Symmetry: C5
Subunit: 174 residues, 5 copies
């Protein structure tokens, strides 16, 4: 028994920007702030990561995955940990899990947008059917931008490391 520990935090503005712009494009000044977006992402992460963790404990060969606030009482950072049989085993699995979550959340979040790109086209292809016009021609520019952006399956990250998972030097006290 050896525990690897990573420390993680909300994705930085850079890591969101792609997704956040898409939201501006689609929603103007009703689009949520950058800050809120990062906050939402790490929320989504932790929330899913703690499910992984109940699940991992609820099996024949049980595993201890862990998410807690690094400074007890402070929203960020979050420090995650994992136990495995060998020092390098932990250090590698944690990382794998952190990524496993990230990916799975991210995927779902990309789905939301690629859904909204088509679900809020039904207001853009629905102003052409309203005509067939002064402020009305701005809708033509917005639909051009809602076409100009492409949500690549590698843009969104819902977390950022503060400390990459550790190689434990000592083994766990039993």
């Amino acid at each position: 028994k050896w525990t690897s520990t990573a420390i993680i935090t909300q994705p930085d503005a850079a890591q969101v920007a792609t997704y956040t712009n898409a939201l501006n494009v689609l929603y103007g000044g009703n689009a949520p702030k950058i800050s809120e977006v990062q906050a939402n992402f790490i929320s989504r992460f932790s929330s899913a990561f703690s499910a992984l963790s109940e699940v991992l404990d609820n099996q024949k060969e049980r595993e201890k995955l862990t998410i807690e606030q690094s400074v007890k009482g402070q929203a960020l950072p979050l420090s995650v940990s994992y136990v495995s049989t060998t020092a390098e085993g932990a250090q590698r699995r944690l990382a794998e899990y952190i990524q496993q979550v990230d990916e799975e959340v991210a995927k779902e979040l990309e789905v939301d947008l690629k859904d909204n790109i088509t679900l809020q086209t039904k207001t853009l292809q629905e102003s052409l059917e309203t005509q067939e016009s002064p402020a009305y021609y701005q809708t033509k520019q917005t639909l051009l931008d809602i076409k100009n952006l492409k949500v690549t399956a590698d843009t969104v990250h819902v977390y950022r490391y503060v400390m990459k998972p550790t190689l434990p030097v000592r083994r766990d006290s039993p």
Copy 2:
């Protein structure tokens, strides 16, 4: 013969709140609470109720242990709820039931709290127009007799002697149509969302 089952639940997403969020705009527009806020209020209402059920259940004659705690001690969401029982699927069954129980219990309270708002809005809006059109009549009956005070510009005054109102009052009457024609499906209002469904305990607890 004690096994806990746990679930992880969070605030309801926007879609599950659509119904109630709309009706709140229709009835209020500007001062109407943001989706964010509604979402929060809902989960808050759930968690509060579930923590009461919890207390009830422990003060039963035939004691039950149902719990609610923050999944990441310190973070507001998600909440992880758990329940101990006779058998593994007993726990898993009952957890779920109890979750719907609270959900529903609260969903009803909301639906009631809404039809209560439908009442108090209409009461004032009808009473506003009943004061607006009691005097916008009167002030136009004053004019038809303050001009009928004939003699200061003589012949032309007899030509001085069909109501159209502000588009401010025209809007109010149009919204009060929507507010009086607001339909509340209690089966549409959902108060929490799953992160993880109640678990089927593989092991068994013991101290």
Copy 3:
């Protein structure tokens, strides 16, 4: 021997705060707190008072255990209060009373705070009305739109019906409990 009764309480209903909140609009228009903010205020004053009582009851020669805590840990509301006593009925009884004690005690301080200002603005508004009345006539020798506002707001101020049965600083989520079983000795 020792029995613990337990209520669960929360911030007052939007409706339960309505009169008070209104009275603050009439008295302050845009510096007047949101309903939501009065709600949170009120319960905060409840729990602070309730905390104090608790501490006092423990500092008696004849020791009493009254406690307040967040029902879901590290989640603001609801709060669950509890009382220990010698009989299950007695525990339930005394709790509800203490909750009421606190409620009323806070309410009447908040009442007295508002009735300070019904009295206080009827002084600060003749000092803007009857001051602008004779000071108009100093322009007549050597009427304002803001003056009628002052007149109107004062008219509203005197309409205010605030009996100390206005203020309610908490609502139950669950009324005190009748404990089947006593404490683990």
Copy 4:
């Protein structure tokens, strides 16, 4: 022979903060922090300093146990403070004296901050009065040379600013919810 005294303390009420809040409006108007925000900031300062005292006192040869913790664990206000001492009446007196000690200490540190914000607004207001004047009068001379070959309130503000001396005696950083108690039982170890 150990006896714990206990006060419960909260943010100071709107009135005890009157001057300082007004003074903050005088210099910033619509961008001044809310009354509420000041109140919060004040008690936050009290608290932080109180916990310093507390750590300091527990590092004497002559150890003293003075503490501060939220009264409702998990809820920001009120917070309850306690002090242990040798004689019951001795605790109650010292606790209150300490509460007063911190209060005062902090008030002074806020007095300074008022002054520092005066002397930093002044030099940004004047430097924007001068830069609006001597760069828009060089636009009046780029209209005269084109013809050839409420900011007065910002000064009024500045006079109110100049006439904003605020007494030290007004500022209180906490309000009691419960004045420190006289312990009836003694502590059991």
Copy 5:
């Protein structure tokens, strides 16, 4: 045998943050975050690093113990930082040490970021003035004093001296202590 030094730290004051905020009030102008927001971000950045240091220091062959926890439990600031070491004075100095070892580490990432931002704003206003010189040409091609403030600022930006030794991400509330007693089993 084993001794514990303790410091209490907070968010940095306006003064310590001025240098950095001024620079943001230039290049982002009115989209610059509030000082409140800046101070907040700083101490956040600090503690995040402090708790990483702590994680590393425990992992060393000879384990080392560095601590960060909220001074008043469940209150945001102040933080209580602490260090254990063999000797009294040694635990004091090495705390202080590890504290500045972080303050620096952070300031340097913040210098790196401001640098990066300067390089973006310069190139974002180069790319604007290369189109504005396609419109300044256009002015007397068919035959504002507002966009002459854009080039006027993009010089304050071009200037900006911001040395990483003038960026402080924490303030002491209490300097690391000299432990009178040793610890205990």
